[PDB]
């Protein structure tokens, strides 16, 4: 829906351009500034909703514990769950961040500045990131003592 | 509605003058002879009326559309070029007698 709105807006801008009006680029720049501010606000709302979901559709990440040669092992490891969570949050970010810019390089092609356009500053990002070592930390904690049971094999009869 | 003194643009042409011409344009055939000065003035006003009415309608339309533009400040930046060319044309015209 965001891409469609941007496409229609850019089509209207191009229609204005072909009519050969006056002073287009500065108007385009101000419109882009406003739309990026609105995008930053919407991204803040979505990111905070995603965070409170962690604490927005989220995929369910799952990993198991098994044993081989009488050793407890993880499949995939906890750091792998960490990386999956970071990848999913990144995808949620580029849902809005991958939106193309409006124009008459990589940064100029599509808008990547909303993080600096954040109405509440990096805090809204940070808290999101923060929830990460909520979850994973408890995870490894909950694993640790449980994993401790493997020591029983290290100690022969 | 505004404390400042608005310098509204008008046209140096009374709309009523043509009426006088019409009076002459009616009284000439009625049998009444009017002074030659009145005849010349009425004829000149009659022949020059279309230009004056065109100017006054044009300036009124321009004032209406420009106040409409300034009603929405988001567009004056784009319309500045057309406003500049219209102002230049007005500046050229005003110096004329």
């Amino acid at each position: 829906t965001f891409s469609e709105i941007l496409n229609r807006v850019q089509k209207a801008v191009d229609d204005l351009n072909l009519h050969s009006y006056s002073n287009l680029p500065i108007w385009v720049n101000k419109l882009d500034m406003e739309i990026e501010r609105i995008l930053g606000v919407r991204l803040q709302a979505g990111l905070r909703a995603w965070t409170q979901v962690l604490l927005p559709k989220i995929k369910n990440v799952v990993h198991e514990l098994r044993i081989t040669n009488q050793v407890i092992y993880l499949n995939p490891p906890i750091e792998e769950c960490r990386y999956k969570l970071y990848q999913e949050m990144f995808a949620w970010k580029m849902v809005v961040l991958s939106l193309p810019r409006i124009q008459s390089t990589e940064e100029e092609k599509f808008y990547r500045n909303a993080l600096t356009r954040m109405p509440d500053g990096p805090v809204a990002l940070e808290e999101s990131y923060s929830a990460v070592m909520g979850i994973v930390s408890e995870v490894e904690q909950y694993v640790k003592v449980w994993l401790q049971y493997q020591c029983l094999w290290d100690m022969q009869a | 509605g505004r404390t400042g003194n608005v310098l509204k643009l008008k046209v140096n042409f009374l709309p009523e003058i043509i009426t006088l011409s019409k009076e002459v344009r009616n009284l000439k055939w009625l049998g009444f002879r009017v002074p030659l000065a009145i005849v010349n003035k009425a004829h000149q006003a009659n022949q020059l009326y279309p230009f004056a009415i065109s100017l006054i309608e044009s300036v009124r339309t321009y004032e209406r559309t420009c106040e409409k533009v300034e009603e929405r400040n988001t567009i004056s930046l784009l319309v500045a070029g057309l406003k500049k060319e219209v102002q230049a044309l007005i500046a050229e015209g005003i110096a004329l007698v």
Binding site: S22, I26 | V6, L7, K8, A80, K83, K84, Q87
Partner: peptide
Amino acid sequence: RKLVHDKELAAEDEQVFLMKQQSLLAKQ
């Protein structure tokens, strides 16, 4: 050397132009 757009088209508020032309008509 990426060139940037120069000074944009100005507004020149109608009041200023009107008063300047008042002056010009006054001295003519």
